[PDB]
């Protein structure tokens, strides 16, 4: 009865694996419109149109830092675009604009007959992710475009931590030992500012500022939570309500918080 549900019934093991159920292909965007470069990852056999996610790196950084999210998320039934910004030194507001330009072009390619993603995207269902200033930009995107279905930035930073207006379901990945954007000055005040949304705070035990980037040692836990969050809120898929909203009870997590995360038959502890 859910028109957006895709793929098999999830398990902890199926979500911790590096590869989800769907075959993934990818291509380079030949003329980026409003951003520097992009790679689009897509499932060939998702069983219907899927939502789209745009992911942005941090200051000085490039697609390599965020690339692993492409195959991880696309294999569970999403079209994912990872971008390079017009300049590696762009600030969060510009990163937000370029993130939204990448989503716009994914929608354009969905209607372009020659494109590998022709007709593969539900353009009414989109999400935003990104690292550090690109995570700040993701929250700016969410604040300015409340029809976005989900946000999941990692080690986010912005010159202001006040995202009180955000109504988009937002998962904040935090890195416990972040010295660039320390948790108590960045990720946690950002999380605490949001009182109008479903939200979650997931702090990775012992993580440096790059703890959610390509090659990290927690792709099982981080990927499981990212996929479950995007599935629950971009697809309204309540098969993922538990994976999305529950404390994962992992030795790799040093701090877990969540609010307005709908769970039937939840305990009271
Ligand atoms: Cl940054």
Curated annotation (Swiss-Prot):
Pfam families: PETase (PF12740). Induction: Highly up-regulated during growth on PET film. GO terms for molecular function: acetylesterase activity; carboxylic ester hydrolase activity. SUPFAM superfamilies: alpha/beta-Hydrolases. It is an enzyme of class 3 (hydrolase). Involved in the degradation and assimilation of the plastic poly(ethylene terephthalate) (PET), which allows I.sakaiensis to use PET as its major energy and carbon source for growth. Likely acts synergistically with MHETase to depolymerize PET. Catalyzes the hydrolysis of PET to produce mono(2-hydroxyethyl) terephthalate (MHET) as the major product. Also depolymerizes another semiaromatic polyester, poly(ethylene-2,5-furandicarboxylate) (PEF), which is an emerging, bioderived PET replacement with improved gas barrier properties. This is Poly(ethylene terephthalate) hydrolase. It comes from Piscinibacter sakaiensis (Ideonella sakaiensis). The lineage of its organism: Bacteria, Pseudomonadati, Pseudomonadota, Betaproteobacteria, Burkholderiales.
